[PDB]
């Protein structure tokens, strides 16, 4: 999540991020319910207050909310104990925010995002861009190994495909932000823009990337002014699932058919319907490719035709159950590397070694009756050294 991302940042970058007022408002908005009040309280105050007082302002009931919000803001480093005054920059910058100091767009965003997904799968008709190709490949969801040949999709790439467009886009931006620092792009500049969007050379490159994903659109030959799309700030289903492992996809887009074809066999193609059968051969292939069963049920669940919505569960339980069993069937044998110790002549010392292995956290399985245990090879030397020491 967005708040998750801010927490995983250094104090130096955070204070830099708390620049123009719009950022402080953006970070303020995500304060869950309580801390928003606390921010307003100690906003006009220039003198730190005791930590005990904050604790006693929340009734015993719903006390857990008092601590969790406090921990969240401590992570955000909004205030400091100073022994709980807010950051002088945040207080000042926030005070600036607090009285101080269309239909075409959505279609464009949906289409431009789709072509990226088209490229993700082996779709010959997809947008081609060297920067985009290396972006996805370096994003951890694609791999080429040969610049001349088009890249394939990694194990995580297939899972990314099934995720809903909101989470599908957000995960991509989250990966984009992390790699921005590695490639030499300042994280604060891009991160600050995203917040300001919700309402320089680095931005110009960043804006071009955002234009490529379809989140932003200048419409005026790349003018200074841009018009963000709906997805930039941050739909009815079409699949009918039958009890006999049949999917009737009411799809006109080639991408959705490509998605459904990942984990099912396509039988017939009609302009507003495609007949797909969820055969165990396909699903096992989909699971082998990297997909997780929960995603398949979720992917079919979210794109559920309205007719199935009235039924509960919308997906017939046997289909959902059967898909899971197909997943669990593959992993019947849980392979786990380890080192086995037998011929435990020292029965008394076997327990001592057992206790030592447990303390180190290396032991995986043990059998007291047979006086044997298995330890991962990583810790094999440690136990081997312990045995040699005697």
């Amino acid at each position: 999540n967005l708040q998750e991302f801010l927490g995983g940042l250094s104090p130096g970058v955070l204070d830099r991020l708390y620049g123009h007022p719009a950022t402080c408002l953006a970070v303020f908005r995500e304060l869950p319910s309580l801390a928003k009040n606390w921010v307003m309280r100690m906003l006009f105050l220039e003198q730190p207050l005791p930590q005990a007082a904050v604790a006693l302002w929340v009734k015993k009931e719903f006390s857990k909310a008092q601590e969790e919000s406090t921990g969240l803001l401590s992570g955000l480093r909004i205030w400091h104990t100073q022994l709980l005054i807010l950051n002088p920059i945040f207080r000042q910058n926030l005070r600036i925010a607090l009285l101080g100091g269309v239909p075409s767009l959505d279609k464009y965003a949906e289409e431009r995002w789709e072509v990226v997904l088209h490229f993700m799968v082996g779709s010959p008709s997809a947008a081609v861009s060297q920067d985009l190709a290396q972006l996805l490949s370096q994003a951890g969801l694609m791999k080429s190994t040969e610049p001349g040949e088009p890249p394939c999709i990694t194990s995580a790439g297939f899972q990314f495909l099934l995720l809903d467009t909101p989470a599908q886009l957000w995960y991509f931006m989250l990966q984009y932000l992390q790699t921005a620092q590695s490639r030499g792009m300042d994280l604060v500049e891009i991160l600050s823009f995203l917040f300001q969007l919700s309402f320089s050379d680095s931005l110009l490159n960043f804006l071009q990337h955002l234009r490529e994903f379809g989140l932003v659109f200048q419409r005026k030959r790349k003018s200074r002014r841009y018009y963000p799309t709906r997805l930039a700030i941050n739909q009815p289903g079409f699949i009918v699932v039958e009890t006999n492992y049949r999917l009737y996809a009411y799809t006109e887009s080639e991408l959705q058919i490509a998605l459904i074809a990942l984990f099912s066999e396509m039988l017939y193609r009609f302009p507003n319907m495609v007949v797909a059968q969820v055969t165990r051969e396909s699903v096992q292939q989909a699971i082998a490719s990297g997909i997780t069963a929960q995603q398949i049920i979720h992917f079919l669940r979210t794109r559920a035709h309205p007719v199935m919505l009235k039924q509960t569960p919308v997906l017939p339980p046997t289909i959902t159950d059967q898909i899971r069993l197909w997943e669990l069937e593959r992993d019947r044998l849980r392979f786990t590397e380890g080192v086995l110790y037998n011929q435990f002549l020292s029965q008394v010392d076997f327990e001592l070694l057992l206790a030592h292995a447990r303390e180190l956290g290396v032991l995986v399985f043990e059998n007291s009756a047979k006086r044997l245990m298995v330890v991962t090879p990583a810790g094999h030397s440690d136990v081997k050294r312990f045995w040699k020491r005697q």
Partner: peptide, 15 residues
């Protein structure tokens, strides 16, 4: 009033 058994009523799959 003679409700269905647990196994038939709700899924028994671990997942």
């Amino acid at each position: 009033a003679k409700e269905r058994p647990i196994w038939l009523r709700e899924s028994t799959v671990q997942g």
